[PDB]
Design a protein around this ligand. Structure first.
Ligand SMILES: [Fe+3]
Length: 294
């Protein structure tokens, strides 16, 4: 199994993932090969091209990855709540800054932050919520959305890279993932950051600073970031790892993943550690993950 690492920081974690498993997995056990590819769909073409074997995509990404004449399929899925009460999904939430007296109503001429183009909480869900209203010339969605906010950081797009000129993927700073959309909000975003619900607590273990932001709700109202089950834009399926439909290394892939979660799972400090890393935030898997269901 040749895991596809999306650029430098991920490449580094993969490197870590590689050698530890080499210390645990039988005198063989998959024993990975870190393939690096600047972007995710880059990793998609790589897998299909038989250049790679796997990657963990957002579920909006798992979707477009099923596109064409034979594209990939989900094989392993992460499950976010506990070990006690797993859970195969999360919530999209619109995170904003306390006191910007604007509601989901008036996103109007505001600047916003996203995770990336075509992801669940970062784009699919908020735009779904938002068009109709979006400028008629709704030709391109990207273009009515350009036309509708007035500053945005939508990584991996191409325009709306006004807050992260170039719209890159992970070596992008005040932009890119969850992590980075939220960083976009901490300065720069007309207090709109479309994330996941577990994002503020990842970044902020301080209640006081966390009392500095709120959520935007359908029920046209702002609320404390602690009660997101009551203010959350929508529910979303969950990140899965895709492997080719035919001839992928499915059972191998799950062989890897399932033994690498026993060592290196949620509760353990095996130098390695699956669901967190020093090279930054959500590399190879999401930090919020707890494990893997098949
Ligand atoms: Fe996601």
């Amino acid at each position: 199994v040749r895991w596809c690492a999306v650029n430098d920081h991920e490449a580094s974690k993969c490197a870590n993932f590689r050698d530890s498993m080499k210390k645990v997995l039988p005198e063989d056990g998959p024993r990975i090969i870190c393939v690096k590819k600047a972007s995710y769909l880059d990793c998609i073409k790589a897998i299909a091209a038989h250049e790679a074997d796997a990657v963990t995509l957002d579920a909006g990404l798992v979707h477009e990855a099923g596109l064409t004449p034979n594209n990939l399929k989900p094989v392993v899925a992460e499950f976010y709540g506990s070990k006690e009460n797993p859970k195969t999904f999360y919530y999209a939430v619109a995170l904003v800054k306390k006191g910007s007296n604007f509601q989901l109503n008036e996103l109007q001429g505001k600047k916003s932050c996203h995770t990336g183009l075509g992801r669940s909480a970062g784009w699919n869900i908020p735009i779904g919520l938002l068009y109709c209203d979006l400028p008629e010339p709704r030709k391109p969605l990207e273009k009515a959305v350009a036309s509708f906010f007035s500053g945005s950081c939508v990584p991996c797009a191409d325009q709306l890279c006004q807050l992260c000129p170039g719209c890159g993927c992970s070596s992008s700073q005040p932009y890119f993932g969850y992590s980075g959309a939220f960083k976009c909000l901490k300065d720069g975003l007309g207090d709109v950051a479309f994330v996941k619900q577990e994002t503020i607590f990842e970044n902020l273990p301080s209640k006081d600073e966390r009392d500095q932001y709120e959520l935007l709700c359908l029920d046209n109202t702002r609320k404390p970031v602690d009660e997101y089950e009551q203010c959350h834009l929508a529910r979303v399926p969950s990140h899965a790892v895709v492997a080719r439909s035919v001839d992928g290394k499915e059972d191998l892939i799950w062989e890897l993943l399932n033994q690498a979660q026993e060592h290196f799972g949620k509760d353990k400090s095996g130098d390695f550690q699956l669901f967190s890393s020093p090279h930054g935030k959500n590399l190879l898997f999401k930090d919020s993950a707890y494990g893997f269901f098949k």
